[PDB]
């Protein structure tokens, strides 16, 4: 019956699940467990560069908290 179309469709769904999900996980893996920082407009880029400089390990996602203010 018509549900015999469901298997192949399901396969397609799986094939369409992989890309987006993958991106998210990679964005969590390369950005220290947080969302990848988006930078348009050249002000967010300056914020990211300042974060990288004050990080000390040349990685922007490493966040310095209030414990670093002495």
């Amino acid at each position: 019956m018509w549900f015999e179309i469901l298997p192949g469709i399901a396969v397609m769904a799986a094939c369409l699940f992989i890309p987006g999900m993958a991106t998210a996980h990679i964005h969590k893996f390369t950005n220290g467990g947080k969302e990848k920082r988006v930078a348009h407009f050249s002000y967010q880029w300056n914020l990211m560069e300042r974060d990288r400089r004050i990080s000390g390990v040349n990685r922007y996602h490493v966040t310095k908290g209030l414990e670093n203010i002495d």
Binding site: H40, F41, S42, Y43
Partner: protein, 129 residues
Amino acid sequence: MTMYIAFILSTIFVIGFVGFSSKPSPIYGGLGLIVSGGVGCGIVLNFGGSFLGLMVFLIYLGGMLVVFGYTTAMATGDWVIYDTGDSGFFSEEAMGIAALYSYGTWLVIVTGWSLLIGVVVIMEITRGN
């Protein structure tokens, strides 16, 4: 300094212009012009002109060279002079381009009249008789 990527792109642009300037097999001249247009749009995009580079890539390549090939088918140092400041919370290119409607009223009027007259002229010329 990536081996003067801008200089490399400019050299490729000049090479393509020389290649299609000999005009061999005008379809191949058109293809060389397509490659040169891609290289030039790449130069503009690398410089920071995202909207203008995309405007080249869309208008020029996808409309004008497409119509050219269609009609033919019917027949037989850098990185230094740049700035140091920031642009704010927008892109200056987009603001300057969008100012066409608030600042460039005269430009819009003359361009629209020219385009309408161009449509009329094309119809009159291709009427035939």
